[model samples]
Target chain A: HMESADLRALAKHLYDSYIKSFPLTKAKARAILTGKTKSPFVIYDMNSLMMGEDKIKFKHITKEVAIRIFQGCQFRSVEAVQEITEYAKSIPGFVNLDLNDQVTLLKYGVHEIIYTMLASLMNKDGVLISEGQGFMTREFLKSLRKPFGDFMEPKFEFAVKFNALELDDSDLAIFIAVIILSGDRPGLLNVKPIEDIQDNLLQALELQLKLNHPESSQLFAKLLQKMTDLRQIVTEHVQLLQVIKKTETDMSLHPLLQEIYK
Target chain B: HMESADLRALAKHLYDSYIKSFPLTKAKARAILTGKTTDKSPFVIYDMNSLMMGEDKIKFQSKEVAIRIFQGCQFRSVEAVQEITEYAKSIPGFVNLDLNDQVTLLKYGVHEIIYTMLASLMNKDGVLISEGQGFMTREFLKSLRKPFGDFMEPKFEFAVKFNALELDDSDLAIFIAVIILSGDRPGLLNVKPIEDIQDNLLQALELQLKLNHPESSQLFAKLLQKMTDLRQIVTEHVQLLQVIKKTETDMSLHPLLQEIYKD
Candidate 1:
């Protein structure tokens, strides 16, 4: 019933932007991603954050090394934020939102986005890092215990299962858009417009997903469930992150990330 | 002027989507951009392993270094071109165009699209990595400060002015389609349908702009003006790029971007 020219345009818009933002997605969708026109949903290994040849084995992450990794990830996050900003801007009506409302969504949603996009690199065993130049083991992360390890362990569970949906880059791109456009962001000022914008994404996503995952009944339903799962994970991760910040006071978080925490 | 309820609906649709996407743009944008900037340059032009340093700046100095920067931007364009092409496929009437028309539109129009998109990463002083790898300063770029300097300076100025328009990404989406499908591109075998598509996209663009920025009455006209300004840039860009390729023998460019350096 919702299929109109405008809705289709939104789908096409998100799809096009998705291909551009995600790596290897366009290539895979077309001839392929390393070649560009890639997925907005491409994945990366966390250890790629290392400055040089030195890869941080989870086992080797002493407090000092951990501090550097945290700094690097925060540093690295800006790059992702730049893309996130670009990709988000491409979605219809997003720029029209109150600036604070927009910040609220991103502030709350960015980590969730990072987690969701991680599905690309995830497996039952663990996520890949360094684009397969190095593979981080789930077992290795847990062995490091509570600090960074704990934060990852839960996300691993989420991503591995989320990966099961097999949503491809375009599907994931819309999902990310919705994630940032969430209605529940605490300070959401223009709720009507937010929800209206969100609805188009949902409709377009449903429409987009059905075409891509045509045979899979309830696939969108499963994705909806994944949203619930993600919320809890985001909620809990923040708690743990709060714990880390308190205990590891000397270890500075990325300045941008600190703003979100604020 | 196809302002069907559906078309306005499409404009509304894209506008809503845009609203969801550009959160925390100004304040958070500035805050996030600060990160490790290293002044070293065996610039790994386009390697996935090197991408983790996405926020850091890698400095390079020399003809080859500028050349490599050229390639890196070209390499950055590698994915950019693909995305633009993919977006082309979704532009309603785009598929019906002569396949040759599609490619011509894409080939000629992709740089303008890329450079416009680059405005997303930048402001006045510098743009964060459009290569999607790391940030680069105009200072460092100015240090490389020769032909590459002359080439990018104008574009960066264009970039800063473009950002001031605050055009919704929804407007940009349709506008980009218009850029590609324009009748003016030299080689179009079927110019009429292409113009029709541009006509439709402009309608969508006008609808999107007016809807989103109701108070900004002059925006649609002004944005159209910027569109030509961008055309001026890409042609100038092609000329300078050709010069760089000839003078800097070591500077390699991808066949895709290198080939675009022509009519």
Candidate 2:
């Protein structure tokens, strides 16, 4: 394999460029996103006029700030969701990822993304950080829970159908690893009562215990230790990225490193 | 990976040593096989008196030759099995096979043992041709078919199971290549009652097909084609070993190169 340095460099460059050029003019953004561009921007631009702004730290334009302070921005500042779609689509090899490779990368990305959100909240105390919240909300959680539960049912029922298909220690170990890496986080919503994420965790545990062999306790002991280590890594990364995001004056970020930030 | 030259040299040396120790006593052969004793012969004593006299082109010295020729032989041959075992074991990075080397060698021996039987049959063909009612009879076929069927099941099952578990394509390819090389044989047996063997072959094919996946069809095709080639190699081997054994001449067989006859 080529050194990971090559992939790191390419990833860094893409990140920096995307962050710098992003949030295109609403018309251009929507057009690029929808494959149809026309004059854009809307009434939301008028609503920002009441928040007064100053020349201080205003030399670099923030789309939120530009319309908020002057209420004089052109229709070019607002970006649509399509821009993100295009960017994700352009990533090389994402479509061709093999099963094991896809599983590995998914684990890696989920860990990183979760840590990034968690650290931002911890460091910028009282930030009401619903970072990626749209995707991880309670409604989404409830919608997905039943389907996932159904998928796991037949997996444990194999013994009833066939004697040769009994679960072994290695199978249990990798299964536990996959669940922790991909689905450990639970929904947190402020609109209603806070939900207990640990309940879902316990339910999964209960099902496994019902299906597991006598050797499973030994396997679980090993995987339990791994999950603890994974949590620590996630916590550490969140802190690192949070600190890096802050301490920059007037949103000035390095072109090279900004790629990583994006 | 070790260079092919290293493996080729080892193979050559084993064969040379085996040929050097040309004739062995039946007691020495039995002790070497059946795990009773570690004493091994390069000529590898056979329990079959017919084979003992036929293989070395030797005149029977006494009853020992007749006893050996009458009984079935055990593969007391250590040169070939040990040569492959030692070489593969010595290579540092062959970790995948480290734990299972003994089982691998045993299977190789089983493959070789069958090939040796073929060699014996090839040598006796001239006698049978002269006798008119040859020993390649229905009774012999029935007796051999059950053991051959047992030997084949593992070969078929391992071809499927281990291929998936192998860490890489190269490892899987090499294992398959070895099986093809070992099992290739000329159809020399002319027994009238081979229906049982045919039935077992059909059953094995069905079991293998039932487990077929998208990735396996091409592999299966390649292996089946290779099996045909191996049959030719085995046929050629039987003919040569028979001609050599008929003369009762002492020859050198190197420890590292005995695998060609380990059949």
Candidate 3:
């Protein structure tokens, strides 16, 4: 078994590395969306892109703007999984799982982990997007077209509550590890052993929480409680995605996302 | 790498033993509650409203009386776990785990398992509490005084859809095993072997469902989904208990339940 002190250090390091990949914050996201922080990619207002001088319309330009926005969101999501995958590999026993078990854990686990990170970027009202310049109001998100809007609203609802728990980077590290190694995902070929790994990770988390959060003995249970919240968030997200796929055949979903929903 | 056939036979036997120990149903529970079903055991109900009623009020129950009712509730709750404990030991691989791991599994897992069984006893409108005599309306449960009511409300919400899935005894046997041997329970000594057992049970459950419910291709997936629902139900239950323990000093909790909620 890995010692609690070593596990705590590793979790902190993993969280820091993850932050490096996305570095998303209210201030940073705002700078990226506005011109304050110059970027290779340009941000455009959808309305301005669609309407042109002298009755000239740039349909392609408006489409490009929308694609860029979604592509950025997708890239961040993908990057999170990639970073977490690397982080899990570095943990003592994670890489020892069979390849298929590893894949099942990552495949089923990504969305849940993503929302945990998203919770960090949220407040009571909305989440910060586009480097902080675009504040996606909960109301504005609910008003968007089906599927896309449906997705963010549930996440926001969960994020608001999860953020209320006040987890720091160390807590997030162990939490992310718990999500990645979860044994509940269906179709796992080698469950007993995978569950064993999950047990170890949870023990590490529990021990670390007790040592670190002396004032709050209930933090471990509270963290476990937030996991149920994550499950609800992902359940709604998947259900909505299924509806969108059925109704909008022409819509293109990312292959990674398709795999996730599948 | 146990074969599916062996796993199937083991699961069938496990289900038989489980049903034998826990023959509780709405009809039976109602009988027990109304004092028609005689077990030499004593029965008591702590009226929560009366406990909190003012000192001079006619409805007020003395502290000693309140404590006794809580004790009775505790006795029944402990008896329920004892029945589950007996069933878990009968499962083929359950006892094979380290003693500490087994304790941790049962410690954290019993409530989720209890709620799963409760869901089987539930119907559309609400749960059949104390067997059948008391049908706790969903609205009344929601209207309950603070945390006490909060515990039952979410279980009723989840149980309705869970019952809709319509799993048979064989399916529930393996499903209950899955909940008990769960690798996700907090603070296990060795999860690898425990998860190994969980994996075998899941694979067995999938194969068994495929053969048993051949027409329902999605039955396995649906059952897994309900496990997620069960987790949510139990989480809400734990959160409420935490609040009550903190806010209501006079409210006496059962030792077993208080132990379970101690994190």
Candidate 4:
């Protein structure tokens, strides 16, 4: 059992690191590491395990985290949550984050911790992030964090935020950071700055502090805080500084900034 | 100018207190005021004036305030912002609360502070508190000082507060004292806080707080505060004291209490 867990972790690392090139290998890793579990996409069966067994509950595993993972990744509609949860529940180490289970999950889940792991996994070079792993694209990473970014740095996505703000890397960093911070959980996902977050965040924060809609704020705040932390880390990274400086020099060479830089 | 302002205030008071008895009074009030000048609802002309005149940047008097008041009050959906803005532009006020105008109105309008004033005037008793108001109910009020009220306090209506912990009489007193808070604004001679209000109030609070949504922890928090405040307040009020005390008599008496009151 220990060996299996280790292998599962290894496979996860391998998959996340893009060591296994083909999608087929990914499936093999999941099946071999965990037993031949049907995809969560399959329907729960009555006859399979506890049929006619006096049952207290007929609950199945839920994909609460995965679904939330999907939400922070995009503006996923309710359908997406349903479909993803259905697909994820069929796996080992996966449980139905149902209404009841969801309640517990919200209370106990270290949302920011787990999600940070997920984001880090996504950030790994060559590891694709998408609904279908095959549709992996780097731009998807950029988009996943855009909404929060837009809230934090309206100038970041000038086209979407408004027409006036200059669209550039610095703005994008603030934007992405905002997205990351807000993605901490549903309510915490007040991508708007602190000043703007008051009205919206207050209710969510109050709920979280009061333990009301814990899950609502939990997932959103998790995403939000994670993004915020990630952006802070990214800001401190030498690579990002290099990128910003390079981009600035390039812009200076461009006609718009030539006079200013000159 | 002061006299004109006072007259305007008095006219509004007369209109709110006597001229209009129903929330749908835009039609009736206009009818009475115009003395059959036309059968058309004044809001129609008001709306038309806002859309047409604002579209060109030249508007008429009170048109902007009227449009913003309308938009700010009946914020039923996300479309309300634009809908109300057009309604304003069509009228005068030069873009329903321009930066300067909005700042001034928000600062000086106080009781009728643009959004709140519109919300109060349009639905005074509490029509705008329903789900139809969308996030605007929360957003517009938040734009103001949030007029501290313990939402948790027991009352027929759960007005918002800047802080959940702060308890104030004004929150309850406003509803208690205001005539608009007493009578119905819809279906002539009808009363409020009783008709569809109980359900609407709960529904509005739930929607604004996103009670049923997956990420409901935060929503749950505010709701509990409101519930606790309510329970605490009712206990203090002589009339409601029995209901508060009887709550302990049997849990089943309040079937949905857990939904509202919980940790």
Best by DockQ: 3
- lDDT at B225, model 2: 32
Task: Give the worst 10-residue stretch by lDDT in candidate 1 chain B.
Answer: B39-48
* Model 3: DockQ score: 0.07
What would the per-residue lDDT of candidate 1 be over residues A219-256, giving only the tens digit for each residue? 55456546755665766777887898788766755687
What's the count of clashing pairs in each model shown?
A: 31, 42, 22, 58
CA lDDT scores, all candidates in order? 0.64, 0.30, 0.64, 0.28
On residues A183-240, what C-alpha lDDT tens digit does candidate 2 reach at each position?
2233311211111222222233333433455433322222332343344454554564
Which portions of model 4 miss their true places by more than 4 Å?
Answer: A1-121, A124-262, B1-117, B124-263
Greater TM-score among 1 and 4 belongs to 1
Candidate 2 lDDT by residue in tens digits, B85-150: 443333222223323333433444334333321222222111111111122222232233323323
DockQ preference between candidates 2 and 3, better one: 3
For candidate 4, write residues B141-208 as lDDT tens digits: 32221111222122213332312322222221111112112112223232323322222222233333
Q: How does the DockQ of candidate 1 come out? A: 0.01
Q: Which regions of candidate 2 deviate over 4 angstroms?
A: A1-262, B1-67, B70-72, B76-80, B83-97, B100-263
Q: Pick the candidate with the highest TM-score.
A: 3
> Candidate 2: what's its TM-score on chain B?
0.25
Interface Cα RMSD in Å, per prediction: 19.9, 24.8, 11.3, 15.7
Q: Please state every model's RMSD to the true fold in angstroms.
A: 25.2, 27.1, 17.8, 26.0
TM-score of every candidate: 0.43, 0.19, 0.47, 0.19
lDDT of 4 by residue, A2-40 (tens): 244443443343233232222222333234223353222
